[PDB]
């Protein structure tokens, strides 16, 4: 979503969710769960080497596994 | 790839989206979808662009013909 600040993209991000919540969307995306991530708690706490590459293959791999 | 090439490719790819999408994707669609991608977008490149206006295409008409 592009535009300028204050328009309501995260809005929109949110009444996606509530269409999901409500039922007005698709069969594919009947039950999909939306999750927000901040990158910044993803970089949290992760001075070795490897790990943040670690944290984020984990939730890739768990994406995929979850389908939905 | 040039444009005949791109035609090619997206008739060989049809069948992929056919599945997915489930539809049927003309050969005049493929060749308007080419010449159009190549004539107005210009921040991409012949084979992505053209491939992503026939799947949002097909994903438009499907929304349309889905929803009630
Ligand atoms: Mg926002």
Do not use: C, W
């Amino acid at each position: 979503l592009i535009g300028e600040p204050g328009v309501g993209k995260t809005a929109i991000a949110e009444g996606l969710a509530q269409a999901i919540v409500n039922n007005e969307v698709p069969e594919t995306l009947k039950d999909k769960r939306v999750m927000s991530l901040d990158m910044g708690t993803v970089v949290a706490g992760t001075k070795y080497r490897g790990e943040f590459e670690e944290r984020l293959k984990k939730v890739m791999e768990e994406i995929q596994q979850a389908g939905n | 790839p040039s444009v005949v090439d791109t035609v090619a490719i997206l008739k060989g790819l049809r069948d992929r989206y056919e599945a997915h999408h489930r539809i049927n994707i003309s050969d005049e669609a493929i060749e308007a979808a080419v010449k159009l991608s190549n004539r107005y977008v210009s921040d991409r490149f012949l084979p992505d662009k053209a491939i992503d206006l026939i799947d949002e295409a097909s994903s438009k008409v499907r929304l349309k013909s889905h929803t009630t």
